[PDB]
Amino acid sequence: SKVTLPPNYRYGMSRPGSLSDKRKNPPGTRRRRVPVEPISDEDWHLFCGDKVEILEGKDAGKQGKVVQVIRQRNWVVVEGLNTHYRYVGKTVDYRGTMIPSEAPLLHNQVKLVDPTDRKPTDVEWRFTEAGERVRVSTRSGRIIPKPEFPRADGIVPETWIDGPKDTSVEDALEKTYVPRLKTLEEEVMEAMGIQETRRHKKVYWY
């Protein structure tokens, strides 16, 4: 299932259907539109899970790993570099667990760094002779591998145990289709031995 959003919607690093986002922007609000630089999917070279460097901010020159990207506002966020401190445990007469949350950053402020020399580079998309599209650095002239990142589900295929209601891999990949010219209905009738002799009468369509 998917949620619908008004055209005048502002993205705030929160899930659109989440309670925090709902309380931040009620369904009856329409805020001023922020200018977002148009960057296409074929030109968005900032992925999730790769090491990047910070250009401007309090942590100038520091490097961190990207943990999330928001294409709507051209935002990229790194874990624990550009941080402001906030209290998460709030009660009537008790406080604590003051954690550093981190603010989002723009593509003009975050640029990819190659793992060879660990120095900032500019990334340009190139088409390899093998039929693959891999990012190629221009300052040094080297390819940057795709930063594989775990999915939000939290399960890795290397360690998975089948439950009572999961098919085995061999059963799932077993091929038993015989491509003949019979419908599913006819094949099921033949398989189960259901015999029907009489046929439908003339039916007019108009």
Apex 79 CA angle, 77 and 84, nearest 5: 85
Of these partners, another protein, RNA, none, which one is at the site of residue 205 (CB under 5 to 8 Å by kind)? another protein
Choose, by CB under 8 A, the member of 35, 72, 93, 141 that binds another protein: 35
- Cα separation of 144 and 134, whole Å? 7
Site for RNA in 154-173 (CB under 7 A): none
Residue 196 beta carbon to another protein: minimum distance, rounded to whole angstroms: 6
Beta carbons within 8 Å of 52's beta carbon, 6+ residues apart: 46, 63, 64, 65, 66, 76, 78, 110, 111, 112, 113
Site string for RNA, 92-131 (x = CB under 7 A): ---x-----xxxx---------------------------
- Cβ neighbors of 117 (< 8 A, separation 6 or more) are 140
Distance CA 189, CA 19 (A): 51
Of 27 and 164, which has the nearer Cβ to another protein? 164
Nearest CA-CA partner of 187 in 197, 200, 177, 202? 177
Closest distance between another protein and the C-beta of residue 203, in Å? 5
Which positions ≥6 away from 96 have C-beta within 8 Å? 87, 89
Region binding another protein by CB under 8 A among candidate stretches 17-25, 112-120, 127-135, 165-173: 165-173
Closest contact distance (angstroms) between CB of 100 and another protein is 31
Helix (H) or strand (E) holding 69: strand 63-70
* Rounded distance between C-alpha atoms, residue 84 and residue 102, angstroms: 6
Under rule CB under 8 A, residue 92 binds another protein? no
154 makes contact with another protein (CB under 8 A):
no
Binding site for RNA (CB under 7 A): 7-8, 10, 12-14, 20-21, 23-24, 29-35, 82, 84, 86-87, 90, 95, 101-104
- Contact residues toward another protein (CB under 8 A) are 35, 37-38, 155, 157-158, 160, 162-169, 171-173, 179-181, 183, 185-186, 188-189, 192, 194, 196, 199-200, 203-206
